[PDB]
Design a protein around this ligand. Structure first.
Ligand SMILES: [Ca+2]
Ligand SMILES: [Ca+2]
Ligand SMILES: [Ca+2]
Ligand SMILES: [Ca+2]
Ligand SMILES: [Fe+3]
Ligand SMILES: [Zn+2]
Lengths: 166, 399
């Protein structure tokens, strides 16, 4: 009889139970945590360039794996009940690698590089990164806050795509 | 409390020049007399700098006021440097002036199309307008078919203005373009125009008469001056028909050699100098008049490696000491922009959204009613090959 897990999410008891079943089946060695290697054992994830970024965001305690609390709170960002700001903040977090709350030049480059590969020259990519920052940086520190990020993309309605059924 | 890290601390490609963060102010651009400092402006623009909006407006509006008081067919004498299409290729424009000579001691005539296709159109406009403000009697600008509401709204110039400046700046450019003269008579011997002839234009007086202060209409003499082309078989035609419907442009006409001959002879002209069509060599000399032995028609094209894919030379025409000498030049490096000026967030976000959601869908699909019991992201996009591929963009946009 272990201690209750505490979490915050949009899910009712039934949904948490169903997610629990998925968690267990994903947890191959049954350690109660989810390793990178366990995520990668799903062939459909092997060519997805954002997998490690998603895992980093889910792993809020930073021990390199995703436990059940983190799994629930991660998936909850994609609940149909989640708001625009929530989906957008998750998107912001894809770019914000070191999690300090500001997208920097180097991070924007690196994350774009993960997605673009060799479709652009490094010089080209640096130039569009530079201009994106300049155009979106409203207080002149050279990096992009969440507020400045939303002012740019909040009209795109991408949040309406970031939704899964559980 | 430690300050932020230096702006370019974690920047990955450090050798790449970083654009200025501050817009040029009025104090910096305009001297004590209200005169613009062209070298201050040029240096800033070459670094991809911007100006304060009020300065952009001031430059555009003053240029417009000067242009508006010119005749619709201006008269200019030799010596002169005549230039064709520029198409927003600002960094090539810089080379053009190095080749042609400084406007401080060199007379210039531009045949239009300053904007669209290239992603530095506004910089081209600001810089040429400033030169017009500084040298109103030695540098001249004509209207091209792209200097209008219809084309800039279809192509990227309107979006360029919205992103770098505002719709106010775009609207100011539209009024300024309405003021551009339609033609130049050079040294009483050459008619210079962007496109060419019209079945409704038989004398210079037909041009002088035109009300130019308007959007170019879809047909008629003003339209034709900006839009018409020599026929593909110019000088070697089967039919003797002077004009035929321009199937390439979707409007206006092809004019043939007989049509040009008649016009030259009726008006005591030596040649027509025009632009409007890309040339591998930067220019084309068409069939010589039997009478004079001089090229009846000349096309000049001043945008090298047009669209970054044509690989063509550019040229300007220098008319001095009774010699017309063509000076060719090659393209110059320029900074990169994503298609239609989109920032990388706008570019990448749909892909991010799609891929993270796909991952989660796959992750959650690990059970199926058991509970009841490269990197795949890309951009957004020979002379004769480039031409055929870009054929639809030479045609007039719908409505
Ligand atoms: Ca495990
Ligand atoms: Ca963890
Ligand atoms: Ca950061
Ligand atoms: Ca900032
Ligand atoms: Fe053109
Ligand atoms: Zn043209």
């Amino acid at each position: 009889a272990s201690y209750p897990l505490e979490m915050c999410s949009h899910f009712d008891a039934d949904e948490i139970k169903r997610l629990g079943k998925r968690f267990k089946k994903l947890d191959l060695d049954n350690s109660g945590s989810l390793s990178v290697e366990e995520f990668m054992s799903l062939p459909e994830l092997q060519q997805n360039p954002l997998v490690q970024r998603v895992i980093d965001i889910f792993d809020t305690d930073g021990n390199g794996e995703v436990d059940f609390k983190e799994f629930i709170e991660g998936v909850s960002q994609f609940s149909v009940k989640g708001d625009k700001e929530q989906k957008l903040r998750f998107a912001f977090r894809i770019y914000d690698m070191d999690k300090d709350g500001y997208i920097s030049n180097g991070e924007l480059f690196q994350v774009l590089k993960m997605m673009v590969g060799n479709n652009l020259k490094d010089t080209q990519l640096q130039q569009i990164v530079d201009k994106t920052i300049i155009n979106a940086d409203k207080d002149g520190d050279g990096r992009i806050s969440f507020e400045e990020f939303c002012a740019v993309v909040g009209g795109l309605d991408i949040h309406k795509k970031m939704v899964v059924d559980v | 409390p430690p300050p932020p890290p230096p702006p370019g601390a974690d920047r990955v490609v450090k050798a790449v020049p970083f654009p200025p963060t501050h817009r040029l102010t009025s104090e910096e651009v305009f001297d004590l007399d209200g005169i613009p400092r062209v070298d201050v402006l040029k240096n800033h623009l070459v670094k991809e700098g911007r100006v304060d909006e009020e300065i952009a407006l001031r430059i555009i509006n003053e240029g417009a006021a000067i242009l508006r008081r010119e005749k619709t067919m201006i008269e200019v004498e030799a010596p002169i440097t005549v230039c064709g299409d520029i198409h927003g290729q600002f960094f090539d424009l810089m080379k053009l002036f190095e080749v042609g000579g400084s406007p401080a001691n060199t007379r210039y005539l531009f045949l239009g199309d300053y904007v669209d296709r290239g992603y530095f159109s506004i910089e081209c406009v600001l810089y040429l307008w400033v030169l017009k403000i500084l040298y109103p009697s030695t540098l001249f600008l004509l209207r091209g078919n792209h200097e209008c509401r219809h084309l800039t709204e279809y192509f990227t110039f309107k979006q360029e203005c919205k992103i770098k400046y505002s719709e106010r700046v775009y609207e100011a450019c539209m009024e300024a373009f309405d003021s551009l003269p339609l033609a130049a008579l050079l040294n009483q011997q050459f008619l210079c125009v962007h496109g060419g002839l019209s079945p409704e234009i038989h004398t210079l007086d037909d041009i002088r008469r035109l009300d130019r202060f308007k959007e170019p209409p879809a047909f008629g003499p003003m339209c034709d001056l900006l839009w018409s082309d020599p026929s593909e078989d110019f000088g070697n035609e089967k039919s003797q028909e002077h004009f035929s419907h321009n199937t390439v442009r979707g409007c206006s006409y092809f004019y043939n050699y007989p049509a040009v001959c008649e016009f030259l002879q009726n008006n005591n002209l030596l040649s027509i100098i025009r632009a409007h069509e890309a040339q591998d060599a930067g220019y084309r000399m068409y069939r010589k008049s039997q009478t004079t032995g001089f090229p009846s028609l000349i096309t000049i094209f001043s945008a090298p490696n047009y669209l970054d894919v044509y690989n063509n030379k550019a040229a300007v025409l220098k008319y001095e000491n009774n010699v017309m000498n063509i000076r060719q030049f090659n393209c110059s490096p320029h900074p990169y922009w994503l298609p239609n000026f989109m920032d990388v967030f706008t570019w990448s976000l749909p892909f991010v959204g799609e891929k993270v959601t796909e991952m989660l869908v796959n992750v959650l699909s690990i059970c199926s009613d058991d509970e009841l019991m490269a990197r795949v992201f890309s951009v957004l996009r020979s002379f004769e090959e480039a031409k055929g591929l870009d054929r639809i963009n030479e045609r007039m946009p719908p409505r």
